[PDB]
Design a protein around this ligand. Structure first.
Ligand SMILES: Clc1cccc2[nH]cnc12
Ligand SMILES: [Zn+2]
Ligand SMILES: [Zn+2]
Length: 582
């Protein structure tokens, strides 16, 4: 308790001395309270006019229009320590898993050089804006690294000072840029050297990208077994138990020297002990500790979520296969079987799973999995939108399975070659493209974000009619040579000024390991759509008056935007479409 966290606590206490008080009406139970000090201040979702002007029919679809307008009583719930039988299975699996992830990997500290190169190309590392201003500035200053160094040597002694979380079904936990570095130095390797690639982790999909996920599920489907299950966990970050945080820490048994200690520090002092600063209108800043839950770097979170989820799902598989009988206690002769299962078939069982953070698809050996819930529910990994003890509804077709907000279509090119293409409700896709995050955007920046979306649609969602059209319109309405932008950057191959037909060929034909014939496609008309009825089901306006008026007169919308932007150099991309071709 207060020995490990109190130092950090005292330091803030003293900086806001003229304000301190123990508020006798503090709304926490599960969060350990400490006090309050005076503040007064807060970003909301602005509309992108380049994208909106070029998608007029949607100005009247509420599912689209509402997306641009607008539980903290779930971060304040407490998870129950698992049984002795559960806690044993988790610890055995974590060991075997970590060793497997490390069989062909070397843990290693990430560097200041690598950290600087991250910041000098916009990758949301979650910092605060105060002694400097932006991320860029502070990295180029030497004083910073003297503060970073103090804390680094502090960590080598097992004490912490400036590493405090800032809260703001999502809960974002911004840290000050220094503690970010040190979190990155120790654990960045997990991300940077791809510990959860599919090659390496067998269940994982890090670095895979939306044009592979579909092919991966279809490969999974090919295994002999039961239904594909895809259970969403209810508030996964909040259901991370202290035993989870401890099994994750077992990565350090793979380390040495300076590293092993620094890794051990981050886990000990920031992950398995926490300190956080939250707003409250009655306006103040409450300083609260808790020992468990997730509250890390958005990246490390991903890797450790994937790891613990991989673990849960091997175990739930075990309960289905009847490897263990009860979670109340493991017999010694049950350990020998649990251990031998992992060694005999564990790798094969990882290959029946596609896991991306809190998100999974399991094709288990049979449908006993569906009702194997004791370990799952006892680990705290309790299922969303279904009763605790009601068995899992599982999917019979891989083209129906939800995965990373998407579903995946099989789609036969006019030449017999097979595309597996990502997809989701068109109102969702068009709604996101109509939205920008932040203040002080120029028409040029707004235009270049519009372009980023258009090029994604062209690469990923070319098979949806409204999107190939809106995409050609946007790319026509925005100067040909202006570069796509994005303030919060998976593989993102649409971020480029290259010919989008050339990028398509490289991605879907040339580099696509599931495509044997490498015959490049010569024009967009060779590139097919979903069925017209399939397009409507996935939220197309094809067949409506308004949609046809829009298509008819598209060149008039394109010019409207061109007129606002100015006398630049523009290309007409609509003659790539059969119907705008004479
Ligand atoms: Cl002790 C231990 C950890 C991970 C994997 C293993 N295989 C055999 N023994 C093992
Ligand atoms: Zn620290
Ligand atoms: Zn679809």
């Amino acid at each position: 308790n207060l020995d490990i966290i109190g130092k950090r606590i005292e330091k803030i206490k003293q900086e806001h001395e003229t304000s301190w008080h123990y508020d006798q009406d503090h709304p926490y139970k599960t969060w350990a309270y400490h006090g309050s000090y005076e503040t007064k201040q807060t970003a909301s979702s602005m509309v992108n006019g380049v994208v909106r002007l070029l998608t007029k029919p949607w100005d009247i679809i509420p599912m689209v229009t509402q997306m641009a307008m607008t539980f903290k009583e779930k971060v304040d719930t407490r998870t129950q320590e698992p049984k002795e039988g559960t806690k044993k299975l988790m610890k055995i699996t974590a060991e075997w898993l970590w060793k497997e992830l490390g069989k062909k990997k070397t843990p290693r500290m990430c560097t200041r050089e690598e950290f600087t190169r991250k910041v000098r190309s916009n990758a949301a590392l979650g910092a605060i804006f105060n002694k400097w201003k932006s991320a860029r500035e502070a990295v180029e200053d030497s004083g910073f690294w003297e503060l970073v160094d103090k804390e680094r040597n502090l960590h080598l002694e097992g004490k912490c000072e400036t590493c405090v979380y800032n809260m703001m079904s999502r809960a974002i936990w911004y840290m000050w840029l220094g503690a970010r570095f040190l979190e990155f130095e120790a654990l960045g390797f997990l991300n940077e050297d791809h510990w959860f690639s599919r090659e390496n982790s067998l269940s994982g999909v890090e670095g895979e990208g939306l044009h592979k996920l579909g092919y991966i599920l279809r490969d999974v489907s090919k295994k002999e077994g039961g239904a594909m299950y895809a259970d969403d966990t209810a508030g996964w970050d909040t259901r991370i138990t202290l035993e989870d945080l401890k099994n994750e820490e077992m990565v350090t048994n793979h380390m040495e020297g300076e590293h092993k200690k620094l890794a051990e520090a981050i886990f000990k002092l920031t992950y398995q002990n926490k300190v956080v600063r939250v707003q409250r209108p009655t306006t103040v800043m409450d300083i609260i500790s808790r020992r468990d839950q997730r509250g890390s770097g958005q990246v490390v979170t991903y890797g450790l979520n994937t790891f613990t989820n991989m673990e849960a799902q091997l175990i739930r598989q075990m309960e289905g296969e009847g490897v263990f009988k009860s979670i109340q206690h493991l017999t010694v002769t049950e350990e020998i079987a649990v251990k031998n299962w992992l060694v005999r078939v564990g790798r094969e069982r990882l290959s029946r799973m596609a896991i991306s953070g809190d998100d999974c698809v399991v094709k288990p050996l049979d449908d006993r999995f569906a009702s194997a819930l004791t370990a799952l529910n006892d680990m705290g990994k309790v299922r969303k939108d279904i009763q605790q003890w009601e068995p899992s509804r599982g999917w019979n077709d891989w083209t129906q399975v939800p995965f990373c907000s998407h579903h995946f279509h099989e789609l036969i090119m006019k030449d017999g070659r097979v595309l597996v293409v990502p997809c989701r409700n068109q109102d969702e896709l068009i709604g996101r493209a109509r939205i920008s995050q932040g203040a002080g955007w120029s028409l040029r920046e707004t235009a270049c974000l519009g372009k980023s979306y258009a090029q994604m649609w062209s690469l990923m969602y070319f098979h949806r009619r409204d999107l190939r059209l809106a995409a050609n319109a946007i790319c026509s309405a925005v100067p040909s040579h202006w570069v796509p932008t994005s303030r919060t950057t998976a593989t993102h191959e649409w971020m480029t000024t290259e010919d989008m037909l050339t990028v398509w060929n490289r991605v879907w034909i040339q580099e696509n390991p599931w495509m044997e014939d490498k015959t490049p496609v010569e024009s967009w008309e060779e590139i097919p759509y979903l069925g017209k009825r399939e397009d409507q089901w996935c939220g197309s306006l094809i067949g409506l008056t308004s949609r046809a008026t829009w298509a008819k007169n598209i060149q008039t919308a394109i010019n409207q935007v061109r007129s606002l932007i100015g006398n630049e150099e523009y290309t007409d991309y609509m003659p790539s479409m059969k119907r705008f071709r004479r």
